[PDB]
Amino acid sequence: AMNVPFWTEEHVRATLPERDAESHKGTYGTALLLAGSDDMPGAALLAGLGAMRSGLGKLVIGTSENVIPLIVPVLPEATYWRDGWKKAADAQLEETYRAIAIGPGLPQTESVQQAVDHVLTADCPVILDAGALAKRTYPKREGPVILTPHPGEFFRMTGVPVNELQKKRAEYAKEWAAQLQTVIVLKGNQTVIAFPDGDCWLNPTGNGALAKGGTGDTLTGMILGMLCCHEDPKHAVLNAVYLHGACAELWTDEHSAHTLLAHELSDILPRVWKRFE
Amino acid sequence: AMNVPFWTEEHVRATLPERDAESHKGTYGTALLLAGSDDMPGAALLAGLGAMRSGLGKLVIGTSENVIPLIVPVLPEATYWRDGWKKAADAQLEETYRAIAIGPGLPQTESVQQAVDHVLTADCPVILDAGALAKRTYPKREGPVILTPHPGEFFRMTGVPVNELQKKRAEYAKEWAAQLQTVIVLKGNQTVIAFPDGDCWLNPTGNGALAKGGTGDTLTGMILGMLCCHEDPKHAVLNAVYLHGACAELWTDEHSAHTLLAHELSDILPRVWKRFE
Amino acid sequence: AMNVPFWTEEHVRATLPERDAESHKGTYGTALLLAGSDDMPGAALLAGLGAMRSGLGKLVIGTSENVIPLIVPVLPEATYWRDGWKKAADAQLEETYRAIAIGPGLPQTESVQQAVDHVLTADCPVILDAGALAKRTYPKREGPVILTPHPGEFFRMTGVPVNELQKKRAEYAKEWAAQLQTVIVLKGNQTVIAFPDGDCWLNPTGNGALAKGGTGDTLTGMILGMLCCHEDPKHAVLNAVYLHGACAELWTDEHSAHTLLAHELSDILPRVWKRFE
Amino acid sequence: AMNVPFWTEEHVRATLPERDAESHKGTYGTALLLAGSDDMPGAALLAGLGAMRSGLGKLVIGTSENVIPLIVPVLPEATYWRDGWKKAADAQLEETYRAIAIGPGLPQTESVQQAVDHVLTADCPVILDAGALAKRTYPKREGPVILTPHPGEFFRMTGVPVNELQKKRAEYAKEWAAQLQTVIVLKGNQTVIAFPDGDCWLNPTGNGALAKGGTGDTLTGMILGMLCCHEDPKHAVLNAVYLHGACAELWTDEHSAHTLLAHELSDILPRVWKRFE
Numbered sequence A, B, C, D: 001a002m003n004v005p006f007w008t009e010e011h012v013r014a015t016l017p018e019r020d021a022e023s024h025k026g027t028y029g030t031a032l033l034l035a036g037s038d039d040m041p042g043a044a045l046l047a048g049l050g051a052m053r054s055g056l057g058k059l060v061i062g063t064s065e066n067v068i069p070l071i072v073p074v075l076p077e078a079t080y081w082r083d084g085w086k087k088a089a090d091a092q093l094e095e096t097y098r099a100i101a102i103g104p105g106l107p108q109t110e111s112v113q114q115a116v117d118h119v120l121t122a123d124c125p126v127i128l129d130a131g132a133l134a135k136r137t138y139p140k141r142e143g144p145v146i147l148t149p150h151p152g153e154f155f156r157m158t159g160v161p162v163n164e165l166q167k168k169r170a171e172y173a174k175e176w177a178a179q180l181q182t183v184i185v186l187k188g189n190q191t192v193i194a195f196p197d198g199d200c201w202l203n204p205t206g207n208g209a210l211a212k213g214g215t216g217d218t219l220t221g222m223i224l225g226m227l228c229c230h231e232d233p234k235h236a237v238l239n240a241v242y243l244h245g246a247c248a249e250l251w252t253d254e255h256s257a258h259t260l261l262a263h264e265l266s267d268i269l270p271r272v273w274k275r276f277e
């Protein structure tokens, strides 16, 4: 209705970063992932794999103590801030991060919001997902704040009922990105990426293989890692959404769309990303 | 003897569901898996992988507390109801599920039967396997009850000795599906799928690679997931049994039948299912 | 020197079992693996994978309590006898097994020998490896006892120094198989399989990729599983040793011999075994 | 500037060891890896996989008690010295090792230095990495001491600021290898391998896929294993650095350089090493 353009293959190709010969892990920064709780542990593994696959230099995972041992055998490249998401409720971060994500696998509690308020005093891009998404406003700060709601979460944030939202997705996503002054990645078929300066794009990739638990956790991690290796955080968000969907499309070439498990998106991304270089 | 027809490739092709572009995890429902105990933990991983591979939207695994950490690194897409199978002994479920399975890796105790009685007050299809199979009767309810005995379990349920059962498998499975008013998936070479309205089919797929611990746990999960994405639960049961056997047949093309491990059925299913689309 | 014959491809082909359409896990029996301790846990995973890959019907792993959780995510098809190897020191087994192995990852203690004495009152083939190998004698019983020493272990059992043993491997292995009335699988390049009735064979397969920790643990499991699916336990031992070596030979076609990890033998066996059918 | 030569493919080919038919795990020695702590557990898995992939006979991992269970399911071929890195602070090793590595995933503490001092009284090559790297001197001993700093660690060791170091890498690495009488593997693009007898080489392999957490942990393990199977420890160091980089180059043929995870280097090495035989 607003003729929102698609972020196309050519846009992805033009904006994906190089990984120069003369670079080291510091060049690509340290990200912080605040995710995973005792009854929702998996989201931390899913977002952690997503992030480390996506071009960062180092990853610190601030997860609940009992979730740590579940990540290590799969992702021994991550290090930990023990009970990090809980500790972030109590004080500003003393360490500097290139980008921060909070929420996958976290409960929708006031303590999580206290951690959000603390993380937002850092000077870096911050992603809020899942349990960190609430009806609230956001402080003026330098770095972008990126919200990644599915339509149910968007209802929670805005009071716009899902059946109404789905009739005018880009109109609502844009209106709320403007009002909140946050980026909004409104998930679904033709995911909307709405920027608070009024730029808006639709994502052309993806399919129903993604319509299963965990896929958004992987996405959150992909955005996190891409924020570390892209100079322009807009490109990081857009490329992450695009490549996430493209991994599902590769899967369905030889596998049924009913059978994908989220973590496999991370396994597919290395070859998919290569195709866009 | 009763000329029971085979559920054929063409039946599978005609009844497997689509996964539409305009769908999300809610479209494919949330299943509940009540499985896995401290000395039989593996069944929960096997049924959990089977279920998430088979087209559901979300999976909640109600397993013993100490089994949880053993599933997460392999299946980070599942969430948990801590000690769920034990808690189900005490009260009706307050959450709504698209389908429920109970029994793989559970002991054959009265407490498991109490959980069965509670789960049966939900309005959804329910699968009973392994430890949940007992000599008993079933309350009138809307959703189908699907029993998945091997011949030893069928003896436990009915008093029909295995050596007699094996002479007239479909006759006994049909008689007991009618008497109990449950679906009976009577396992073995030429698995019988007997419906309580008198429909009955034989499964043409599978081989001796399946004659090893855990394969039925994987099957239970496959039925669970297929109940979530098929409109007709009869088709879900039939397709699950068929595709389970077909995965073993793919394995034996290049691998010895002596060497299959149950979890690999789940790894094979993505490509096998694609062939039937 | 004694012109001991090789167990050849044609011998393997002639003696490997079928896995009939009309069979179930009971047909292929339940094995018991008594293995793995707190500072040597890995041997239980290695022997467990080896066994379940090798044609048994069910596997019960009697391992230390804290080792259980380390096996489950890799081998969810196994079930457990909690602290089984320790409990076997106290009483005869009340359950019937098709075959038993004891020792991989167990300490060389008197308590392990007490478990050995108890396991030997069962009527089935029994394999002793690693910590279960000691200087001792064996009671008259129906089922074969199969010892799987490397030359260091053979010295421990016999007092024959390794440098002397290696000069006349088959002569010593035969002499001691006769004296003890046990099968002796004397490991190394050209493994000797000596039977207490005086039959003796050399194994023609294998290479230096096997000269690394854990490979014998995998072998012990392979023998265990093959004892369950072969009618003649001599063939089970011989085929296991042969196929174990053949998996290393397949590895070295495209991978360096320096780089094999024991568990990968188990991953290779499905395709290798197929070649001999 | 000093015209330091590259260690080339032809050098690697000429110096990689054989793995003879008549060999066993003792031929290739037992290594000790002192690595992994509660908030940095992954380094032990990464270095452990690296080491066992690289031609040793046995590996003992002296890691913190709670890290053990995280390694076993991935690397069941390793055995353990429980809390080994901590115990090494208290006394000389009573066991003989072919080579020792200390530091990956260890904190930069005085207790780690006490363990270093004890390990150095053994008569074998010793690698110091990560937490074991400090500003210090080294006792006269037979076996080489091999330091594996990245430029940040080199600053910690020497006071040479990174921006100055990077202008004259080989000059500084050589000067400090001479002064300390240690081997220095100065990491980065064109890694410098400086020997204390004044030999020095540059590594021609590798790319930005390596510029991510954990890759140096894998390298430390590769050096450790190669020290066990090479007669000349200089060749072991040089070959390890070379093959490590070559694995990254193989990865980038079909996968994006942004997406490599360190543990995958270990998965690639078997085929890469084969190419140089």
Ligand SMILES: Nc1ncnc2c1ncn2[C@@H]1O[C@H](COP(=O)(O)O)[C@@H](O)[C@H]1O
Pocket (backbone or CB within 6 Å): A023, A024, A025, A026, A058, D150, D151, D152, D153, D162, D187, D188, D189
């Ligand atoms: N190749 C390199 N060149 C320059 N600095 C480096 C290099 N590798 C690591 N560093 C520095 O050391 C830090 C990493 O320390 P660590 O994570 O403790 O191993 C980086 O953030 C850089 O500041």
Ligand SMILES: Nc1ncnc2c1ncn2[C@@H]1O[C@H](COP(=O)(O)O)[C@@H](O)[C@H]1O
Pocket (backbone or CB within 6 Å): A150, A186, A187, A188, A189, A190, A191, A205, A206, A207, A208, A209, A210, A211, A212, A213, A214, A215, A216, A217, A219, A244, B020, B021, B022, B023, B024, B025
């Ligand atoms: N049918 C579909 N087509 C394309 N993308 C989808 C579809 N269903 C779900 N997704 C994506 O899967 C993810 C779901 O996020 P979440 O609900 O947080 O797991 C988002 O990236 C969605 O845009």
Ligand SMILES: Nc1ncnc2c1ncn2[C@@H]1O[C@H](COP(=O)(O)O)[C@@H](O)[C@H]1O
Pocket (backbone or CB within 6 Å): A150, A151, A152, A153, A162, A187, A188, A189, B023, B024, B025, B026, B058
């Ligand atoms: N693409 C979508 N369109 C409409 N509703 C959705 C979509 N994705 C998620 N939801 C809603 O939110 C619920 C999932 O919430 P959660 O499992 O907490 O992430 C679903 O059951 C739906 O009711």
Ligand SMILES: Nc1ncnc2c1ncn2[C@@H]1O[C@H](COP(=O)(O)O)[C@@H](O)[C@H]1O
Pocket (backbone or CB within 6 Å): B150, B186, B187, B188, B189, B190, B191, B205, B206, B207, B208, B209, B210, B211, B212, B213, B214, B215, B216, B217, B219, B244, C020, C021, C022, C023, C024, C025
């Ligand atoms: N020989 C065989 N041919 C076909 N299917 C088999 C065979 N042996 C076992 N199965 C199947 O393997 C599963 C065994 O279930 P369970 O005993 O619960 O593990 C069922 O789906 C059986 O029908």
Ligand SMILES: Nc1ncnc2c1ncn2[C@@H]1O[C@H](COP(=O)(O)O)[C@@H](O)[C@H]1O
Pocket (backbone or CB within 6 Å): B150, B151, B152, B153, B162, B187, B188, B189, C023, C024, C025, C026, C058
């Ligand atoms: N296809 C089958 N035909 C006959 N008996 C079976 C079959 N599958 C399982 N059983 C019996 O039930 C036992 C397995 O029980 P469980 O291990 O408790 O699932 C087997 O040892 C058999 O005695």
Ligand SMILES: Nc1ncnc2c1ncn2[C@@H]1O[C@H](COP(=O)(O)O)[C@@H](O)[C@H]1O
Pocket (backbone or CB within 6 Å): C150, C186, C187, C188, C189, C190, C191, C205, C206, C207, C208, C209, C210, C211, C212, C213, C214, C215, C216, C217, C219, C244, D020, D021, D022, D023, D024, D025
């Ligand atoms: N160089 C070699 N050639 C053939 N087989 C070997 C070689 N080195 C070791 N093995 C085998 O590897 C296993 C070692 O057993 P263990 O010492 O118990 O791990 C046995 O099956 C040996 O025969």
Ligand SMILES: Nc1ncnc2c1ncn2[C@@H]1O[C@H](COP(=O)(O)O)[C@@H](O)[C@H]1O
Pocket (backbone or CB within 6 Å): C150, C151, C152, C153, C162, C187, C188, C189, D023, D024, D025, D026, D058
């Ligand atoms: N094929 C073989 N030939 C000679 N000695 C061996 C062989 N395999 C193992 N050993 C000896 O036994 C030791 C291994 O014992 P273990 O690690 O306890 O299994 C080796 O270090 C050797 O001294």
Ligand SMILES: Nc1ncnc2c1ncn2[C@@H]1O[C@H](COP(=O)(O)O)[C@@H](O)[C@H]1O
Pocket (backbone or CB within 6 Å): A020, A021, A022, A023, A024, A025, D150, D186, D187, D188, D189, D190, D191, D205, D206, D207, D208, D209, D210, D211, D212, D213, D214, D215, D216, D217, D219, D244
């Ligand atoms: N851009 C690059 N080119 C080649 N090697 C690299 C590059 N970045 C990092 N490395 C290597 O990756 C490892 C990093 O070690 P560490 O910082 O200890 O993880 C070392 O082997 C470095 O030489």
Ligand SMILES: [Mg+2]
Pocket (backbone or CB within 6 Å): A129, A130, A150, A216, A217
């Ligand atoms: Mg989500």
Ligand SMILES: [Mg+2]
Pocket (backbone or CB within 6 Å): B129, B130, B150, B216, B217
């Ligand atoms: Mg069963």
Ligand SMILES: [Mg+2]
Pocket (backbone or CB within 6 Å): C129, C130, C150, C216, C217
């Ligand atoms: Mg051994």
Ligand SMILES: [Mg+2]
Pocket (backbone or CB within 6 Å): D129, D130, D150, D216, D217
């Ligand atoms: Mg390092």
